Design a protein around this ligand. Structure first.
Ligand code: FE
Ligand code: FE
Ligand code: FE
Lengths: 264, 264, 264
């Protein structure tokens, strides 16, 4: 069955559907998530004020919220992007800041909450504990409009708005690329390679791609640099590590700059 | 003379053709290798049972031998790939496992044997000794069917089967790309950048590419993470290292994940 | 005003135009530089003897000045390249060596001199001091004839010769790509990400690209591996570092091999 499933976060938190969820994580590594605090209403408000900015902000206003290095980490990047994390943000105005701080907080809360359920369903206690693992280094990227890749996050949450009905996002499921359209009521979750790693290979990190024939909100839940894991265990589930020794950190593995995606 | 030469491994091991071999290594960095234990017969048997799998394995059978992260390190990857190393392998069946373990062992033995001859012909004693250097981290990748690159291996061994007579693989030789067709009786060896490094610049790592108008078996002989070398010597033969200090490891140089190829 | 400005190095060294220069560095991160010791006359002499080599050097002569790994770090690379740094160079002849050593020295002197002025205008004292910072690991690449990128240098100096009048190089300025043609009398300076980093975000690293419808001399002023910086400060100006701890080195950040450019 190559259906992309949907889970209620609330139901998962109540201990329901645990075998289904575990099988989804192992066999597919993607699902829609409902009842997680992330509404089309709220997306709508953040989306409107950032589109207003992209459409109608002077370039002086844009330059004030442009980083001096064009990394798409914070602020505006000209298809146009707006990026945020938990600090060091660049905001065009008081109203924008209120709306986007709130939006970011809800995405971060939902992402930590579903990651907690991924860890619980797989029996996983990260080295250093669950809450230090989840208090991490997220990145939110909003785009206004691929070669297939997998994400290097723990999980990635994706909200979309639809086209005037072309479906750009596709993921591999049961060995075929499958449409992943917008859902009013739901966020799309992709498991990333860090889920695979931390859980000892119990979670798939699916390949996906964004096709050209919209907007996308992508939240990457990314571990801290000092996230530590077992090297021989990494080797058991397909990681081609060049790491001496029995344990390593995320920094050891990926290097000194975050890397969000990888191709085969 | 831009011919790609052929050497008998047995003859090399008997101390013959040493000046020719050394000049080949320095000026070309590629050659066919005969008398190394690698036969079209044996390729044929491994090739048949993996093609049978690619052709006729259910997707359930394929999923069982698919890694949760799509790294093409172990198991099946869908042009289709099957990958192996010395441990943590994923095998579709008892018969497959017997055949491919044997095939892998012969490739690993041939690769270590020609690397030993590369080191001997160049007077090279790796830090830590020859046998610890060669007891390493190989990767075998079988493909069923480029931008030019060089390999980052010590050596790479390549077996091919021919097309129904187009020649896909080409390498730079004397400043032109030259066809490298299948040879019944021989394996194709490319020297990689680690040969250049370990030998102090006595071995070329040739650029090559796979052209679109078949199958390929590619064995990468890759050093351990703790392989140690001299930084100033690396600088003398063209390595643009950013390494503080007088010595470094392969992990220091390449990072926490193996990197098998590099472009200019 | 999206003009690419021009500064006299001599005037900058006399303390003139400091507010203009600072605003250029912050808002644009590129400028032409006159009065820096870099003449079309001198370019002409180095260019003629390397073109003579590219045109009329036998392949045996080319192989003698070809590195065994094709990294484009030193010597000849076949559009054709010739590369140099402060040592370990490969020169085709006595006359070539005299001319190119001199040319390299003038480029290195000009690059250090404008970097010194970037640091002074921004109030910047690198950890370890200015002169240890500038006594670094430059790379000169001459090409005989893109996806947009930024440079990871401190500064990059670019001399060009014109086409028979197409303008290949373009950079983002005030949110549009702008032609950067040859100037007889001037060198083009791009600030790189290390300028952004060392100065605490006071310098832009502009995106740029080389368009297909000539020659280019590109000098990268690149820090030493042990160049040390503040991690939280790196985070403040857009660097998406995965670095544990309060300070880090360039090697920590970029890895064991120099990386000269980066895309978004
Ligand atoms: Fe993705
Ligand atoms: Fe290759
Ligand atoms: Fe550049």
């Amino acid at each position: 069955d190559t259906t992309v499933p949907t889970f209620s976060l609330a139901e998962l938190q109540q201990g329901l559907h645990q075998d289904e969820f575990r099988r989804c994580l192992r066999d597919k590594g993607l699902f829609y998530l409902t009842d997680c605090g992330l509404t089309d209403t709220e997306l709508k408000s953040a989306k409107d004020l950032v589109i207003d900015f992209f459409e109608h902000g002077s370039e002086a206003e844009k330059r004030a919220v442009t980083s001096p290095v064009p990394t798409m980490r914070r602020g505006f990047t000209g298809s146009m992007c707006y990026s945020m994390g938990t600090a060091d943000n660049l905001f065009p105005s008081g109203d924008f800041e209120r709306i986007w701080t709130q939006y970011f907080d809800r995405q971060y809360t939902a992402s930590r909450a579903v990651a907690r359920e991924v860890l619980r369903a797989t029996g996983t206690e990260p080295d250093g504990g669950v809450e230090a693992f989840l208090d991490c280094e997220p990145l939110l990227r909003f785009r206004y409009f691929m070669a297939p890749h997998y994400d290097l996050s723990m999980v990635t949450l994706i909200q979309q708005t639809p086209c005037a009905g072309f479906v750009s996002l596709q993921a591999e499921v049961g060995g075929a690329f499958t449409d992943l359209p917008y859902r009013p009521d739901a966020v799309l979750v992709f498991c990333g390679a860090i889920a695979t790693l931390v859980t000892g290979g119990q979670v798939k990190a699916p390949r996906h791609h964004v096709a050209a024939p919209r907007t996308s909100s992508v939240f990457f839940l990314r571990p801290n640099a000092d996230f530590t894991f077992s090297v021989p265990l990494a080797r058991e589930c397909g990681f081609d590590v060049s790491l001496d020794g029995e344990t390593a950190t995320f920094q050891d593995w990926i290097g000194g700059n975050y890397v969000n995606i990888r191709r085969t």
